């Protein structure tokens, strides 16, 4: 509008105020993302990115908001003409869409640096003309709505961000780039990165926002940070109630990652009467089995996180197989560098870390350690095997020897009378799925790891030193 | 610390 009945709460003089907007915007038909974002954004700005002068909370004003709404409108409806693309029936169009998406685009700065903190919502847009990648899909979404373009609707996977529209909301339209140096798609489907089976498409099961879920999605893009080393303490409540507040709505049940999100405010500053952040993990598991086809790797990676902050070997180690196997059923493709890095990070640094602690609490007399739960070393082996699947059929190759000797040092980790109880059954039981593991079967008893022909194995090298 | 998609586990 912005109309009467949004304008009553201000001025928004504390968190609490900001919530009691955004579950006023949620009771309503179409939550207004333009006013929300403007709202978050204004109030991120004055609590991370310029504190100086704060003494509490940075009031939000109706007329800073309503000025800031009526650049964003007037922007956005001076900019797109809807005469020049009739809409057949409440559907949009893909020309629509692109133009749309260029209005936005067309608006940013030339020259700024994307991944920047802070330049995720509309008062960034507004204010300094700056958007990161995602931040732009959600903008041409706002502004779609503030359009009147109900069927527009923000995409997610777990890396990117487009959006759906049309008939059935059955189209999709690129609308902002992905990743650096990447060739931009915009106006494109998703169709050729569902087809080649990359995480970055989720084959398909990503999430296709409704309107709250695109509140969901703002709220999720809340940045606490102030620096590396300082968060602020009223975003982080900020965020943490906004995400209760659509949890308690319904409108976190098909998001996966912001379960997880939420999962880590409690962790970090629990509510009271709240499910654990275990229960929320959980949750967001559930979440991506029941609406995701259990394609997602966020949910597991969430979980794993948490166990390995409360340094919970096997726990860590389960859900980090569980991220593999839900991984080795895609093909790693161009653009699905995000999750080679988390693989690549947890496999050579965090459960090295993680076991290089356990031997030596394993040495200074640890029991049930996860070096002698030869479950762990299952776990272990599922989450290589899922990751040698996951390269299977791969039009770029996962495995390198800067992986082989993590694994020779992290399978050496357990001594030879725990890996010798994992049972590899052929189709503590374990059975393989990569050609690379079941190849590596024989080696994984040896009291003294072959570390030369575990390498052999993993990287597929067809030879040794000729000298 | 490095940008992530919003939703995205932290970073460390």
């Not at chain 1, 038909?29 to 978050?40: A, G, Y």
């Not at chain 1, 140096?181 to 080649?196: C, P």
């Not at chain 1, 340094?311 to 093909?331: F, G, K, P």
């Not at chain 1, 190759?397 to 049972?423: C, D, N």
Request: hydrophobic share 40%; aromatic share 10%.
């Amino acid at each position: 509008g912005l109309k009467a009945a949004q304008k009553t709460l201000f001025p928004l003089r504390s968190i609490d105020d900001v919530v009691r907007l955004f579950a006023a915007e949620l009771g309503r038909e179409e939550p207004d993302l333009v006013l929300l974002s403007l709202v978050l954004g204004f109030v991120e700005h004055f609590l991370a990115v310029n504190r100086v002068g704060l003494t509490y909370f940075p009031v939000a004003d109706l007329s800073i908001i309503a000025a800031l709404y009526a650049r964003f409108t007037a922007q956005i409806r001076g900019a797109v003409d809807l005469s020049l693309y009739p809409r057949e029936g409440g559907v949009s169009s893909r020309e629509l869409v692109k133009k749309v998406s260029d209005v936005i685009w067309n608006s940013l700065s030339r020259s700024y640096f994307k991944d920047r903190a802070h330049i995720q919502s509309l008062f960034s847009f507004i204010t300094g003309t700056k958007l990161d990648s995602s931040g732009v899909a959600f903008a041409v979404v706002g502004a779609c709505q503030a359009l009147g373009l109900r069927d527009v609707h923000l995409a997610l996977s777990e890396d990117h961000a487009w959006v759906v529209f049309g008939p059935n909301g059955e189209q999709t339209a690129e609308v902002t780039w992905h990743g650096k140096g990447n060739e931009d798609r915009r106006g494109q489907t998703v169709n050729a990165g569902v087809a080649e089976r990359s995480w970055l498409y989720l084959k398909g099961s990503y999430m296709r926002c409704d309107r709250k879920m695109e509140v969901a999605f703002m709220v999720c893009a809340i940045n606490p940070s102030i620096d590396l080393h300082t968060d602020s303490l009223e975003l982080l409540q900020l965020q943490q109630k906004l995400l209760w507040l659509l949890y308690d709505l319904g409108h976190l049940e098909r998001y996966p990652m912001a379960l997880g999100n939420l999962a880590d405010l409690e962790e970090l500053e629990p509510t009271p009467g709240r499910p654990d952040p275990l229960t929320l993990y959980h949750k967001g598991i559930a979440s991506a089995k029941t609406y995701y086809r259990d394609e997602h790797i966020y949910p597991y990676m969430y979980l794993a996180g948490y166990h390995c902050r409360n340094r919970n070997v096997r726990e860590a180690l389960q859900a980090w197989a569980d991220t593999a196997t839900v991984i080795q059923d895609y093909n790693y493709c161009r653009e699905d560098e995000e999750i080679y890095k988390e693989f690549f990070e947890v496999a050579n640094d965090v459960i090295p870390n993680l076991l290089k602690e356990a031997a030596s609490l394993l040495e200074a007399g640890s029991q049930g350690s996860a070096l002698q739960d030869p479950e762990c070393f299952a776990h272990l082996l599922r989450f290589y095997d899922g990751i040698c699947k996951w390269e299977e059929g791969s039009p770029t190759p996962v495995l390198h020897v800067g992986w082989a000797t993590f694994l020779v040092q992290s399978l050496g980790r357990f001594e030879g009378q725990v890996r010798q109880k994992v049972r590899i059954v052929s189709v503590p039981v374990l059975t393989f799925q990569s050609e690379k593991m079941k190849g590596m079967k024989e080696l994984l008893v040896a009291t003294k790891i072959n570390s030369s022909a575990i390498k052999l194995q993993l990287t597929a090298q067809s030879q040794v030193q000729m000298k | 610390a490095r940008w992530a998609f919003p939703x995205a586990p932290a970073r460390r």
